[PDB]
């Protein structure tokens, strides 16, 4: 009958029933109403995204222009006054990455107040050109709370589930990969390790095998793009909380790189370790014969030592520290720094060994991977010294990836080696890649040497120290 369907129709023209995607907008509004600080800003950006997503799927919906005005009101409230100066860049990122735009938005507020001018454009340029800041969906859905750890990935293995299960349980029976839980019902694995942390445990054949089937499983999920296995795991199987952690940390490092370029006194460094300062130091160091009085020159009002090693053999640093450890102890050295290990996981393992005297399996696997002598850790514990890991959690094809690592290594070196107890020196071992400063078109990052006010050193097979010159194009 013509009656009804018509009666049904204007029941809709008046009060249209709440759809599944309009409800998401109505719920997103409640977040804008209740949230404070940065969360409220991010919610507003997420609101605009859900509005823009709604209009695309539903062009003829009558809610469009009502939502369009709503988006206008929100956008105007956000970028009022001096905030419109960087509106274009931020709002462009907010179209795909609301939470990332919010972090930059907070910086833009401080820059509207005169603080750290130029940081906003730097963080925008990074978010547009650095692949690691590209839109990363990750895994969204049901996540277990039974885990005794914070899962970084939720990888669906599929056909490689059987082979992964074997090498995982083989590793867990050896005290490796403890933070990992399987689920055959979904054939997924709740992994608590990053791509970088697994790579430092590949010294054990059991882990490297499981690492293989993991990387292969990711390539099955996305063989159409040019993304590496590491990138796929982030875009497809990464935990949402972990992605927020990575984005937050990566924003902090850019801000760290920014402040390093203005506040680090390079003028004093070049006067002390370059030109005349380099000549005065080299000649005074050359006059010293034997190990002990050479260390006296190098630690003459200097917080520590920076010895460099390059790729291949080149391990005089690791050899000198192990053999002449008490010679360092005499000079006041109490800390030994290694760039060979990543701080986030290696440091609790090292501290537990230095305290109990028992080396865990996970630490033993790391030492095997990085070809580190266990005798070093034994002599360090016997001498009451502390070994610290100095590497960041970054990758080993853009320039931004190298600048991130160079800056993140600086922050680690600062929070560990810069402010030791008065009288305590240190001996850190870096590659010659970080003892130098990064001078690229896309930015500048001061080297470890600059932020720690120390020269770059090189020790020969005859235990003779020579001061390396700064690499400047």
Numbering used by the authors: -4 to -1, 3596 to 3987, 3993 to 4069
Quote the study that presented this structure, word for word.
To date, more than 10 MARTX effector domains have been annotated, including several domains of unknown function in Vibrio species, among which the fifth domain of a MARTX toxin from Vibrio vulnificus CMCP6 is a Ras/Rap1-specific endopeptidase (RRSP). RRSP catalyzes sequence-specific cleavage of the Switch I region of the cellular substrates Ras and Rap1 (18, 19) that are critical for a myriad of signal transduction events, including innate immune defenses. Structural and functional bioinformatics and cell biological studies revealed that RRSP belongs to the TIKI superfamily, and it is composed of an N-terminal region mediating its localization to the plasma membrane and a C-terminal region responsible for cytotoxicity. In this study, we determined the crystal structure of an RRSP from the sepsis-causing pathogen V. vulnificus CMCP6 (VvRRSP), and we demonstrated that it is a metal-independent TIKI family endopeptidase.
The C lobe can also be separated into two subdomains, the C1 domain (α8–α12 and β1–β3), and the C2 domain (α13–α22 and β4–β11) that adopts a typical α + β TIKI fold. The structure of RRSP reveals that Asp-3721 on α7 forms a salt bridge with Arg-3841 on α12 that helps to maintain the structure between N2 and C1 domains. During refinement of the RRSP structure, we noticed that the electron density map around residues Arg-3988–Gln-3992 located close to the active site in the C2 domain is disordered, indicating flexibility and a potential involvement in substrate recognition. Although we did not observe any metal bound to VvRRSP during refinement of its structure, we biochemically examined whether it belongs to the TIKI metalloprotease family. Superimposition of VvRRSP molecules in the asymmetric unit reveals different conformations for the MLD fingers, indicating flexibility.
